[PDB]
Amino acid sequence: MFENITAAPADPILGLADLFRADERPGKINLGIGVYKDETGKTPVLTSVKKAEQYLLENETTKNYLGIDGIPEFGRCTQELLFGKGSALINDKRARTAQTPGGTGALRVAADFLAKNTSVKRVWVSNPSWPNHKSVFNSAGLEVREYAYYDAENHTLDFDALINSLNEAQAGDVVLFHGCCHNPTGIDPTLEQWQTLAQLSVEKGWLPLFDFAYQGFARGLEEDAEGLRAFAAMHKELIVASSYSKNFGLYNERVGACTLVAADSETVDRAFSQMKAAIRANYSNPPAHGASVVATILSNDALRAIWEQELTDMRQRIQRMRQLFVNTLQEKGANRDFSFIIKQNGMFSFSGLTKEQVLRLREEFGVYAVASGRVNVAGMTPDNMAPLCEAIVAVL
Template sequence: MFYSLTPAPPDPILGLTEAFKKDPNPNKINLGVGVYKDAQGRTPVLASVKRAEERLLAAEQTKNYLPIEGDPAFGDATQALLFGKDHGVVRDRRAVTVQAPGGTGALRVAADFIASTLEAKTVWLSDPTWPNHPNVFQAAKLKTATYPYFDKPTNGVDFDGMMAALHQIPVGDVVVLHGCCHNPTGVDLTPAQWEVVAEELARRNLLPLVDFAYQGFADGLQEDARGLHILARHCPDLLIASSYSKNFGLYNERVGALTLVAGSPAAAETALSHIKRVVRANYSNPPAHGAAIVATVLNDGELKRLWEDEVRQMRDRINTMRHLFVETLQEKGVTQDFSFIARQRGMFSFSGLTPEQVKALRERYSIYAVSSGRISVAGMTEENMDYLCSAIAAVLNSPS
């Protein structure tokens, strides 16, 4: 039985990390995996998180199971972060939230809910999108297709192509949208474009599923939720898969949430009963520790202010690296225009490097990036920037 199996292909992103770890070059740089790094190249534990953990450890009295939907305080805090406590969907109890093992877990719960309960035929993904998106939905036996999103000549959104595709999607299908910091391109919709998209989704009765993994990493915690609020104003039904891996640095705690917005409180509660059935058949109930950290921070004024400042510092460092990268490439004599990278947002950018150039960077300089040319700006530091840009300049100037 098992002896007849052949090895599965490695994950294109996590496989890069394994190769990176084995590389003996002291100057090696990992621009593949989406993990925040500070100026010293470390993934820190936030001070707000450590303080919350100290409180939790001192107060902990049980290791009992959480409810199927998770910690209620975590669910309330998640809705307040997404919409604000006074938003209509929260005030009118049209939103329900289940805790999930990371943003990926939230997406999988959404996929199983769609597959088992709704009549959607296809889940539509942006072209390009996070490489794991198709895997998650196809594992739930859902069909996936793509709509145009990235325009290579302008390094912006192919909005005309996107809208033409949305206009042709069959009624009732699911459209996955990136709330901010589009992965892998770093190119986001403007508020005006969100309005047009939301109107089209509502007009055609398409279900938006927002992958919201980077709240706070583009322009600010509230600013990054503008697209979400626009969708909620136009679309009676909405799914949001959110993650606390990046903005809380809780990567290995696997803390995420699936929030469902419906047209009425009764419809939301009915949908929740189906989501709970999906969760029960999958992991039964979620882990407690990471969600307790999030709830403790978001429900305490002092800790929340500290956390908001830490998110701002992470966002500012990433944006600083974007500008420094563009400037250093120019100093190295690179004539190819990389200025668009400074305009993009979040941890990722489409660099414009070809698969051959990415391979050369890896083989000659131990610089690891995804073959598509997607780079994680968070992997750049002031210390490695000169080496990185010198290597890119050398590869770009090499004969093809």
């Protein structure tokens, strides 16, 4: 049965981790995956996370099955993070949330749901976007079409091209939006553009599917949900796949959520039962640990406060790193002007490097970046900044 199976090609992002580790050479620098790093080059477990974990160790009485949709308080907390406390979506019971194995798993169950209980056949993903978007959707049978987004020359959001591209999307089609910290460009629509996209969307009959994997990394928790909340004010139906991998440093525990919104409770209940049916044929119920950590930290005044501070420290460190990056590049001798890096949000920056340039950096300097020229700014430290910038300049 397996004699003819052809070797699958490596993930441009994940296949990078293998090379990096298999690669010897001490000075090797890893700017691939979007994993946070502190000033020392380590990606530690948050203190608030350690505290919640000890709490669980002493207060956990059983490991009994968690229920299809996971932990309730977990679901309640995510909806408030996403829509705000007052929110009518919460008051009218228009939304239902399922705990999932990461944001990747939230996207898959969303795909599985749509492809089986809906008439959707195509999903629109920005160009560029997280490579794995296509794969998740293709696996569910949906077709992936792309819309324009990045103005490479000026390094901005090419809104006209965006509108014009989406003009080809029909009613009943799914359009995927990154809530904030666009991967891999770092450029996001303003609130005006978000409202404009909301207006257009309700007229074209599109189903918005928001991917929120970096809430809190652009401006702040609440501010980062401004786009999403603008859509939710006008849409009767929307799906949101969110993650707690970055803002909670819970990468390997697979904590995410798929939030379903319908016109009213009765409908969302019906729609949700089918979603739970999609989870049951996939993994049964979700992993409790990482989610129990999130719910306990969020349900507790002191723990949440500590967490919120750790989060703003991560955001601020990245912000210092990109500024230092731009300056050291100039200081080091780079001809091109990289000031636009300072304008991007999140952990990355679209360096604007060519494929051969990223190939030489790795091969010749042990510096690891994604082929698209995406570099993880949160992986830059005051100590690796210099050899990194020298590598880059000698490749420009």
